[PDB]
Each structure stands twice: as structure tokens, then as C-alpha cells.
Amino acid sequence: TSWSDRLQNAADMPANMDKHALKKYRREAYHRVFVNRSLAMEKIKCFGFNMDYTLAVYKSPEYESLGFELTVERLVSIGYPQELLSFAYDSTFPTRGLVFDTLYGNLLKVDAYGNLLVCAHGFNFIRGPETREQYPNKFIQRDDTERFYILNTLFNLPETYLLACLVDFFTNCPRYTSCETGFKDGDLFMSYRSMFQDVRDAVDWVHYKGSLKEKTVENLEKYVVKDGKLPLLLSRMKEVGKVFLATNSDYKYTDKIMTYLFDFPHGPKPGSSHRPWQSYFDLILVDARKPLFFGEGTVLRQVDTKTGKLKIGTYTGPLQHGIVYSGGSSDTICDLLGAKGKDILYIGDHIFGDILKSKKRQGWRTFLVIPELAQELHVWTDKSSLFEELQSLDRRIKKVTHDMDMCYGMMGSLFRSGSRQTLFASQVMRYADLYAASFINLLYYPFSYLFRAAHVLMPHES
Amino acid sequence: TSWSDRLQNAADMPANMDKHALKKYRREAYHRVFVNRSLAMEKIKCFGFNMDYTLAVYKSPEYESLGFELTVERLVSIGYPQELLSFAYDSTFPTRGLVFDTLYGNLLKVDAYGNLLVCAHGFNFIRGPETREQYPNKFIQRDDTERFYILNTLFNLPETYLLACLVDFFTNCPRYTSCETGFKDGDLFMSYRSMFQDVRDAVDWVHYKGSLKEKTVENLEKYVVKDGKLPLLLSRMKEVGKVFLATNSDYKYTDKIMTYLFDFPHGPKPGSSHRPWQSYFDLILVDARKPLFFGEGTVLRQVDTKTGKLKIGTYTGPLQHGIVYSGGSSDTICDLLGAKGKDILYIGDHIFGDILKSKKRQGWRTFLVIPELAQELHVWTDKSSLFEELQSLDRRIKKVTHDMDMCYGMMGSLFRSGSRQTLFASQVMRYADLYAASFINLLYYPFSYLFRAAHVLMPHES
Ligand SMILES: O=C(O)[C@@H](COP(=O)(O)O)OP(=O)(O)O
Secondary structure, eight states: HHHHHHHHHHHTTTOOOHHHHHHHHHGGGGGGEEESEEGGGOOOOOOOOOTTTTBBOBOOOOOHHHHHHHHHHHHHHHOOOGGGOOOOOTTTTTTEEEEEEETTTEEEETTTTEEEEEEEEETEEOHHHHHHOOOOOOOTTTTTTTTEEESSSSGHHHHHHHHHHHHHHHOOTTEEESSSSSEEEETTEEHHHHHHHHHHHHHHHHTSSSSSHHHTTTTTTHHOOEEEEEHHHHHHHHHHHHEEOOSSHHHHHHHHHHHHHHHHSSSSSTTSSSOOGGGGGGEESSOTTTGGOOOOOOOEEEOTTTTTBSSOOOOOOOTTTTTTEOOOOOOHHHHHHHGGGGGGEEESIIIHHHHIIIHHHHOOEEEEEOOHHHHHHHHHHTTHHHHHHHHOOOOOOHHHHHHHHHTOOOTSSSSSEEEEEOOHHHHHHHHOOOOOGGGGGGGSTTTEEEEOOOOOOOGOOO | OHHHHHHHHHSSSOOOOHHHHHHHHTTTGGOOOSSOEEEEGGGEEEEEEEBBBBTOOOOTTTTHHHHHHHHHHHHHHOOGGGGGGGGGOOOTTOOTTEETTTTTTEEEEEEHHHHEEEETTTTEEOOHHHHHHOOSSSOOOOOOOTEEEEOSGGOOOOOOOOHHHHHHHHHOOTEEESSSSSSTTTTTTEEEEHHHHHHHHHHHHHHSSEEEEEEHHHHHHHHBBBOHHHHHHHHHHHHHSSSEOOSOOOHHHHHHHHHHTTTTTSSOOOOOOOOGGGOOEEEESOOTTGGGGTTTOEEEEEOTTTOOOOOOOOOSSOOOTTOOOEEEHHHHHHHHOOGGGEEEEEEEEEEIIIIIIHHHHHHEEEEEETTHHHHHHHHHHTTHHHHHHHHHTTHHHHHHHHHHHHOTTTTTSSSSSEEEEEEHHHHHHHOOSSSSSSSSGGHHHHHHHEEEEOOOOOOOGG
């Protein structure tokens, strides 16, 4: 049972919009919207979306496993050894938000202050004393972006696993000599850093120049969660506000995916005429180039939707029905929709590019979609008494911590290691006003709901 | 009753070190150390200090008022109008942490997300609708450091008031025409930005080239809090760990101030021989140039303590008894004292340069001294039922908010406006492990105390 199995199981359920059935439904943690800061829904005038892992949630482990295979195939074709072909994606290893230390070749799970929670070199989990050899203070400076790369997106899950597979393979292959900062193969030295760069380049290539998009679109049922409640929720949002799409993807891909997500023999509700995905949006913007989008952005372009090419020149005209934009900036959206930042609820899965930057740069309200939560909630609930045991204790503490963490996977929970919260968890609490396993959970709350969080008090104020 | 009156009242009290008298004492909020994150004192191997507003707490409003007078005198001498001489420092206006908007000439009190809590143009407090004219989303991008300057230090209190005095004077003087971004005086245009720069330059000049230091040192009793418990606490720290001083000040000034702080006819306890301030430190570093100190730093120099000049050249020798260093970096301290970051408790008043940067860059443990807390606690306690009233209500809400805030001053509490926490309050919670009105409050806790904060849980985990 992957998180996308949980999500698709929920998607297969028709909507019962009886006011009491809705209240009853959002009692289950799985269908709730979780609140970091209060948000009066009646003040929200525009709902904005990212596509990838928001509207189009890719099925797991199938989509990660396809990315992994194509990245491996790309590395082998540029001259990495044949043995790479014998790797197979393992969804029980990677947790999102890990840091790759490019100097020493370690994956690290860290808290918000750069304290090390987990260190693995390949598939060897390094304990306390040995980690102090490389990290004397058990601490990394995460502003050292040349050395440390944070694998924060769901697109980075295959490469998280692949980095560990590579370190493991080269360490154990007698053709290579292991050094502190990489591997010697006779007169060739491959540093962890240049290995990491090859991996990152091959992932980029696979998405932009390779076969990933082609293979996705030829089997959408296999790769993409589909839900009859999607048109229903978007149509209800459009009744009370404007709705926009701002995606990094190009028009052709977006049109293929979105067509699929809306491909029902009815519109919003069963019985209603089907309508094209585009009619659900007051504004559609592709090639957004987020996070730059939330600063200077790029020049505003117009898509020729017949060819899928951009028209030549900067677009200087008004918002017209049927027009599709490319590039631009967050100010474009505000100007064209007549919105102030605080009137906008922006819905995305990228805790940096989407959510952090629209909050810090523009004061947008934010809803983070966290697909893994659909399964982390099930673990959190039926290891209730394991965390409670941990909480009661403050040697047994390290053991309980370990067994709590293993229930999630080899790299533990997205949100913690025992009683120590992750960097990812702290970015969520600080920058996501609202969050959930799916934005569909909004359907379970009335139009003008006040999501409420308790007022925060300092220690001297308590 | 200023906060430094509270502090000096407490300093005049001899230490009763009876174990039960200590427990009883730290029951009072005024003598407590407040905990944002747990800290086992037994793990602390080095205690590090800043001097200014930490060891040497300048008396208020006297010291601010002296800075204000000398800054005014400096502005007048470079050609600002004579009317400036009729300004008088008013300690009831400025609150620390305000933002000066150099485009529009406003002081702003903001939360951690850049939302505006208070806007004043000169001495006119601008209400909701009028503020939306300049701040359509009631929001500033605080990463716009060219436009916005944050007045975060106690040294910035005189200039906070002076900026408002200047805007007020030029607005109401018929020689000048008020414009959106400054003042026209015939064929001369003075922008708020260049006015701000003049003020900032004159404050800098007053500290580095003017008479502020001279006037301080000629009347130390008037300007600097002195406490017999200081030598006592430092001596107790030295029994269990190393103690260091790392200050931005030069040697001559530091020697004058520190000599005064230790000028008792006894050492640590009454009855004991007096010892020189320098014997209380395993390492003394002046001209630290923080915050750069916590990165590359500067070249390590040696002070010639006879002349107060630097010896010529980079110092390459060991830590020797009696040596005084200049410049260097945080790594110098760690290397010479044989400390890891987490073994260090760094004690300072600058929530950015001291505390933020040693935490983020080096993983040091942090103790923030917040002098105003010595008085904000007294207001928090006897407006108990005013905040409680505010808490019960969630038009009356705006009124209660206003009357709560006025008890603190015109720009309200350092920590909030009603139920909305300030940027400053959020920087404290996130980067200060421990905080208090004075670091002397450490004297009330045993050697190996565990300061404890409850574990943090996300909303879905609660
Ligand atoms: O969260 C962030 O975006 C940064 C910046 O904080 P601000 O200076 O923008 O408040 O804090 P970090 O997590 O790196 O300590």
C-alpha cells in the first residue's frame, strides 16, 4: 500500500455533498486539511495551482521506478559501467528531503539547524562515533550550497536511491579504489561531486530531452492518479473566486495530462455535459520558471495552442478568453486577475519553489500538498504507542527511535527521526499555511470555513 | 522605571547562594532563564560573551539620549538645519526592531512574514485604508534590503526616534515641500533614502570618530550598570569550563569598560582579593568584526596591550597566558579552546550578528540577553487581564489591541501587537536557545541544570 494507492482508493469514491456527510468525512485524518496558521476561506479570491504532484499526482513506486530506469539508461549510454543495469528501484530506501554531501558521498537526514539525524554512505548506516570523523560537531552548514544538495522534490526520489546505489557499487567493485572524496580507476579519478553532477544532469536530460514524458503519456492509467472529484472541486472554487494554473511544464505536456485528468463522460457532476479542462481556469500559464517567477520572472509570451509553439514576441495585450500564456511573473497573475497576494491561495507540492517563495516574496497564502502524508498518517496512527513510549521516556531511547523510524522505511519518516523534527517538517510548519495529502480535502470544508490555529506564545508569555 | 532601573535594582542585591534561596529566586519571572530549545548545561564546555549590552549594559534612557544628542550635533555640523537642536530624545516612542522604509519614509512594525502591524510617518500613525495606498497587500518584502532597513540593535534606538523627528520636522516646515519619496527645498531634493543614509552615517561617526566613547568612560556610573554578581558568575563558569570574550570593540575601550565592571574592593565574593578583569577569561578577542567573524573572518592579529595598538603582522603562535587577540574568526576560538560548536554557549544581545549567525553557521548554543524584557515582563504581568480579554474575543478587538500596545510605548511591545507576534519575537524563538533580561540569571541555576522545552508536534501529529 503506497501513498498513491491510498490516494487513488480515495479518488475512486464519488462525492456525497450532503452537509453532514462532509463534516463526518473530514473527521478522518486522511481527509483533513491541517492548519499551521489561521486562514479565513471567505477572504480567498483566487485559487492557484501547480500541475505536477498537485493536480497530476504520479503513481508510486511505478513513476519513480520509470524515472530511475531511464536515468540509469542515460548514465550507461554516456559511459557508466554496465552493472548499473542490474540496479532496481527500491521504494523502501529513499525518504524525501535528504541532503547529499558531495564532498564525502553521504546521504544525510538533518533537522532545521543542520544537526545530523541519519548518515548513510551507500547502504551502510553510520552510527555516532564514525560520523564524528567527518562531521566533528554532527552538523552541516546548509548554506554551503556548493557542497550540500537538498533532495526536496518527489522528482528527486529516484536519484536519492540511485546516488546510494552508485556509492555502494563503486565502493564494493574491486576495479575502483575508494578515497575520502571519491573513487580512483587507474588514471581516472571520479569525485562524489562529479558523480552527483552526472546523476543530476541525467535526471534533467530524462525529463527534458529523453523518453519520460513520452512513456508517461502512453500509459496515463498506470502513471497518474485520476479522480472524478477534481472537476467538482475546481467548479466549486470558480463559483466563489478566480482559478488559475501556473506550471513549469510546457503547453503540449500540460494539455495531454490535463485532458486525461478531466476525461470523464460528464463535467463536474455525473449527468452534466463534459467541458474541456481549459474552461475550468480564468488564467493558464505554462513555462512559469518558478522560483524566478516570484521575482523578476521572464518575459510574458503567448502560446499558439494549435501548434504548441510560442508566438514570436512579448505579449502586451489583455487577458482574453482562450489565451494561454508562457513565462511572465507572479505580478502578471495579480495584475490580470486584479488580486492582492493575500487574496490568493496558492496550491503546490514544492516546499521551496512554490510555497516558500510565494509566501516570502509576495505574501500569497499557501496550501502544501504532501503526497506521502496519505501513508505517513497510517503509520503515525498504528505506531501510536511506539511514539507515546518515546514520549514517556523523557539506550532504550535510541532503540525505540530506531524501531519507530524503520516502520517508515530505511531513511525514516519525512517529518522526524523519533523526537527530532526534520528540516522538511520545519519548512512545512513555517511556510505552508495549510497542508494535506491532497488538495481534494478542501471539498470537505464549506465555502467560508475559518481554518484556525491557536495563537503562538513565547516561553516568557506562557 | 526603565528596564535598566530594573536591572540595576537587581544588580544591587548581594548573592545568597544557599541552594534553596536560589530555587526560590528563579521562581520570579524577572530572574528566570526562558527556554526555546532544551539545553543540558552539563554538556557546555565554553561560555562565550559579547561586551556591549551583555556584560556592559548601558543605562536607559541616559545612554540613548547621549547618542541621540551627539548624532543630532553631527547632522547639524554637516549642514542640517538648526531646528534639530530643539529635538529631545523621547524613550516612549521607539521600540526595537522597527523597519525604516527608505522609499516612503515610514517606520513599520512587521510580523515574521512581512505583514504590517504598525505604520507611522513621522509621528502620524497611519490606519488601515491609508496604509493600503502605499502597501496594497499590507506587506513588505524584507529581503529588499536596499529599500528596507531593520533597526534591530539597542544602538539603533536613538536613530529610530531621530528618523521620526526628521520626517516630522521636514513635513511640517513650510521651507520644504513634501513629496512621495522625500522633500523639495527649492532646487535641492532630499529623498527619505539619502536622509536615512545621513542619519546612519552620523550614528556610525558618533561611535567611531566622535565623542560617545569619551563621554561614556568619563561617567561610567551614569551610563553603565554595575553588579557585584558578575565576577561571581564568571568565576563559577570558569570552574566548570572555559570562558572567552569576543567583542567588536577595540582593546582600549574594552579595557576601560571591563575595568569598571570589575571595580570592587574584592574578587568574586566579598572577602576575596580583587583580580584584573582579564584573569576571568581563557581567551580575549577584540575587533571581532561580527557577523563576518562567523564565516571567513579576518586575519588573526595580536594586541600590544601596553600601547593598545596591534602588533604588525598575522599572529601564528599558540594560545599563551596574557595574550590578547584581534580579528580572527569563530574557528580561531574553537581551535584554541579545543571546542566543538555544541560545547559552546554563546551569550549576546544581537539577534542577528551574535545569535543567528553563530547558530546557523557554526551550530553554537545561544543565550540571548534582551535588556527590555526586564520591563516588558512587568507590563505583561499587570496587563494580564487585558491580553486575556483579547484571547477571549477570538471592533472591540482593535480597541483592546490598541490599549494593550500603548502600555509599552507608542510603537508597542518588542514582541507583539496584540495577538500578532513580531519579526523580532519569531527570530528569538527560532535562534535563541535560551533568553533572559540578563545573563546573570544563570547564577540561579545549578551547574548541570537541564533547561527543558516540550517536544514540538506538527498539526497532523497532535
Ligand atoms: O527559512 C528561511 O527561508 C531562512 C531565511 O530566514 P529569514 O532571514 O528570511 O527570516 O531561514 P533558515 O531556515 O535558512 O534558517
